[PDB]
Design a protein around this ligand. Structure first.
Ligand code: ATP
Ligand code: ATP
Ligand code: HSO
Ligand code: HSO
Lengths: 379, 364
């Protein structure tokens, strides 16, 4: 028997439910803003990450899952999404003289030490917006993430650390001031202050971490991250910053850009920790108990009808025999509230017993009306 | 220089995503109506798994896998399918032993195939598998489910159900096939037994079926699956029966878009927040935030980075904004917000506490 590549986990039925609830909420919020999904390929040519991310980068150096295609091309399971993004953005000319506010969701691959925060295959929801210079757009991005916390009820457990790393020149003529010892540009100071203001007015509490630089070479002015001193993830749930030059660098015309990516596992962990009781929907609403002389063909028939009469309900047609007791229990296992029982009698009588699994009260109903009775019984 | 996308590995721009998501949800939703639960699996697996499960003699294992050697010399492979990975995690977490599990999963698969019609290197599959059920009943349920999917997409009148048993069939397999062939007849599902229908994998056993479309929505095939009772044992766990199918989303999306060019999705924006003048923006985002709580479910985009009214008005059009909540200095000092209906052009000055109501009325 084979196992799962250490650091690359599975999300089982029960865990899945919660992940989908949190995801929807997140997507929904992105919709409330005008943001559109963008779907990018899991692997890209290795030179991309090299060029985009940076050579000296610890990511490039020892975290990438590179390899070779049957044609000698150096391929790489993506470590992030911005690069793949800017790449297709230029590839299909969506960024030239255009505004685009998008988000993507999917896996990323990094070769790191499996931990609580870290995984070898992790999931990111991240969003980028191209075309907007001023701080105003940066502020909207923060506000977006702010809304997210508010919606998950973990607003009380994330802090905004914020910082500006100026431009190339400032970072260029900074080697002296740092390494010798071993200083910002005006337009970047103003742009940062203007953002610091928009937040202040917005009523969003930030903290300027003078020593906050991110792990990628494409960032430029704004740099920020959302951290939980609740150790939901590794500490940082969401992080991101500006990167005006990357579009040009990757071969397209210059346009401004800004974004952030968030660790879904950290998020999901935080939510489940700070909101101890946050269960999402049950897996099965009604479980169709059915037995006797040729029931089944009829039982699935009743079931299909009940699904059209009751859209939105989760109904599971029992299967492969099982005495009443067996099925009732299977019903419970799934967390069915009601059970539409169905013996031969009920079949000949054009009926279907409806048993309320909560109180046990079972009353015979006519098929055409069972839908109505369940609709009330459930809500 | 510019990097391009790995041939056979394509992106889905904003435009096409809207439609992809509408289609996905319907499918998802339908899976939910039946009791099926999702299971999320890893993109890469240990190569032996695909060898062992899929088959050594399989054209798949031979020249199609995206295998590579991890830093630790371990042979890794980018999944060509999900079943193996599924059964795998199934055994791994002890979900299959003496249990019934009805699940589905959705994500990318990879195969090194020389670039064709409905054949990519990275493609997407929605598939589902249920473990624990012997009888033809369960198989029947699975066909019924796919049938409902076509019905909901409006492509029912464009998929044919090819069916076959692959054990010259032994007693048990014959009775099992017949019993299903009937469940179908009774259910009113029209099938065609293709006596020459064998799948490409080595784990299948009796039922072997596929949904085919003549306009070439899929690579002819949209959906395909069959049984595989022994694979749980083969891969190292106690024997239990199993059945499933996987569907090619690019094919399906292609088909739905062909069989009904009508189908599109909600536009990008509902309300586009026009705004300009002496210090507006800080205030403008303030209103916008408010309107979002008052109007949940509505897609509202706050214009950014200058632009004269005309400019902002056209951008609102680009998005397909129905209304525009304009907001100059006056509106600000007056506690108001001009509500313009981009359809008629009729703009009325409304009080902010009331804008929500007007918009709600204006949209639906
Ligand atoms: N291996 C991983 N497992 C889980 N989450 C991760 C992993 N790598 C990155 N993330 C998450 O993705 C976000 C965006 O990636 P980013 O490049 O900012 O990470 P980072 O700078 O390496 O930070 P960290 O040290 O927390 O991994 C991170 O803030 C974190 O929440
Ligand atoms: N490379 C691909 N690109 C797009 N869709 C694919 C690709 N490979 C498979 N599919 C889709 O996935 C379904 C299930 O694939 P499965 O692994 O059962 O068989 P297959 O070997 O892909 O057969 P087929 O040649 O008919 O696609 C197919 O019927 C098809 O719709
Ligand atoms: N992809 C980055 C980290 O993984 C986060 C981000 C996106 N755009 C700008 N910053
Ligand atoms: N495993 C193939 C693609 O993932 C098709 C399938 C699923 N279940 C049974 N057959």
């Amino acid at each position: 028997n084979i196992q799962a590549i250490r650091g690359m986990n599975d999300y089982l039925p029960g865990e899945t439910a919660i992940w989908q609830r949190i995801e929807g909420t997140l997507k929904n919020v992105l919709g409330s803003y005008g943001y559109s999904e963008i779907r990018l390929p899991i692997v890209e040519q290795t030179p991309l990450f090299k060029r985009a991310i940076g050579e000296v980068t610890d990511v490039v150096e020892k975290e990438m899952y590179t390899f070779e295609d049957r044609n000698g091309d150096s391929l790489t399971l993506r470590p992030e999404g911005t690069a793949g993004c800017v790449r297709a953005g230029i590839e299909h000319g969506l960024l030239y003289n255009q505004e685009q506010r998008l988000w993507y969701i999917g896996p990323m691959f990094r070769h790191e030490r499996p931990q609580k925060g870290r995984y070898r295959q992790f999931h990111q929801l991240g969003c980028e917006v191209f075309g907007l210079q001023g701080p105003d757009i940066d502020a909207e991005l923060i506000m977006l993430t702010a809304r997210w916390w508010r919606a998950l009820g973990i607003s009380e457990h994330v802090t905004l650390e914020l910082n500006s790393i100026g431009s190339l020149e400032a970072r260029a003529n900074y080697r002296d001031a740092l390494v010798a010892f071993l200083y910002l540009d005006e337009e970047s100071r103003e742009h940062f202050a203007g953002l610091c203001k928009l937040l202040e007015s917005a009523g969003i509490a930030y903290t300027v971490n003078q020593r906050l630089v991110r792990g990628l070479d494409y960032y430029n002015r704004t740099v920020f991250e959302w951290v939980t001193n609740s150790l939901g993830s590794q500490g940082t749930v969401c992080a991101g910053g500006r990167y005006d030059g990357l579009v040009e660098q990757l071969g397209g015309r210059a346009t401004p850009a800004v974004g952030f990516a968030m660790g879904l596992e950290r998020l999901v962990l935080l939510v489940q920790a700070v909101n101890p009781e946050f269960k999402a929907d049950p897996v099965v609403d009604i479980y169709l108990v059915a037995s006797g002389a040729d029931t089944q063909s009829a039982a699935m028939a009743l079931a299909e009808r009940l699904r059209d009469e009751l859209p939105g309900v989760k109904l599971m047609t029992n299967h492969g025999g099982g005495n009443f007791k067996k099925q009732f229990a299977r019903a419970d296992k799934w967390g069915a509230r009601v059970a539409v029982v169905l013996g031969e009698s009920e079949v000949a009588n054009g009926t279907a017993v409806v048993k309320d699994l909560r109180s046990g009260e079972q009353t015979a109903v006519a098929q055409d009306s069972v839908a109505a009775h369940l609709r009330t019984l459930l809500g």
